[PDB]
Amino acid sequence: GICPRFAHVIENLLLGTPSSYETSLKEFEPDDTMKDAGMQMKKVLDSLPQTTRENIMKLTEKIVKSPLCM
Amino acid sequence: GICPRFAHVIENLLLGTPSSYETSLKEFEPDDTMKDAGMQMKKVLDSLPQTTRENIMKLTEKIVKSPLCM
């Protein structure tokens, strides 16, 4: 159950840059309060190692593409 | 919209307790590295103030509800 625009956002959160991510945000027209919150989130997740983030990517893939999501 | 099994992970990761959340990851039988990264995510997320979290939750919610997705 890959909604692509959503997968775009999630891939930027984990692997992108803060800018890349703020940019995914805007076609959804998030609120002032929603957009601060998303960036606060980006801040803490980027404090993890890049292999870490990556594996989280791998875990995510594993769920949206699992039998149970088809 | 969103695969319900996966909306159930998003919810324990922003709003549950760590054990709710690890349980929810084990039901997919993630390998250990995958799982440990999963756990590292909840660890760092748990430094956010509950309305930040609530705000990430609404944002997720608007995205999947968009005409862009669903």
Q: What is the CATH number of the domain that holds B46?
A: 1.10.210.10
Which amino acid is present at A8?
Answer: H
Structure tokens, A61: 């893939």
Alpha carbons B68 and B52: distance in angstroms, whole number: 24
Say which experimental method was used. Answer: X-ray
Contact A3 B6 (CB under 8 A): no
CB contact under 8 A, A59 and B5: no
CB contact under 8 A, A41 and B56: yes
Sign of the torsion angle spanned by Cα atoms B9, B61, B48, B50: negative
Task: Please report which helix (H) or strand (E) contains residue A44, including its range.
Answer: helix A32-45
Chain A residues in contact with B40 by the CB 8 A cut-off are: 48, 52, 56
C-alpha–C-alpha distance, residues B56 and B36, integer Å: 22
Integer Cα distance of A58 and A11 in angstroms: 11
Note down the domain range covering A40.
1-70
- Tokens in use for A66? 């699992």
What total number of domains does chain B contain?
A: 1
Chain A contact residues (CB < 8 Å to B) = 1, 3, 5-6, 9, 27-28, 30, 33-34, 36-38, 40-41, 44-45, 47-48, 52-53, 55-56, 58-59, 62-64, 66, 68-69
Which residues on chain A are in Cβ contact (under 8 Å) with B7?
none
CA distance A54 to B67: 29
List of chain B residues whose C-beta atoms are within 8 Å of the C-beta of residue A59 = 25, 30, 34-35, 37-38
Kindly report the three-state secondary structure assignment for every residue of chain B: CCCHHHHHHHHHHHHCCHHHHHHHHHCCCCCHHHHHHHHHHHHHHCCCCHHHHHHHHHHHHHHHHCCCCC
CA dist B52 and B58 (Å) reads: 10
Nearest to B27 by CA among A2, A64, A63, A7: A63
**How far is the C-alpha of B65 from the C-alpha of B1, rounded, in Å?**
6
Cα distance between residue B50 and residue B56, in whole Å: 10
Which resolution, in Å, applies to this structure?
Answer: 1.6
For tokens 């945000």, name the residue: A25
Cα B66 from Cα A28, distance rounded (Å): 7
CA B70 to each of CA A36, B3, B37: distance values in angstroms, whole numbers, following the listed order: 25, 12, 29
For residues B20 and B62, is the Cβ–Cβ distance under 8 A? Answer: no
3-state secondary structure of B16: coil
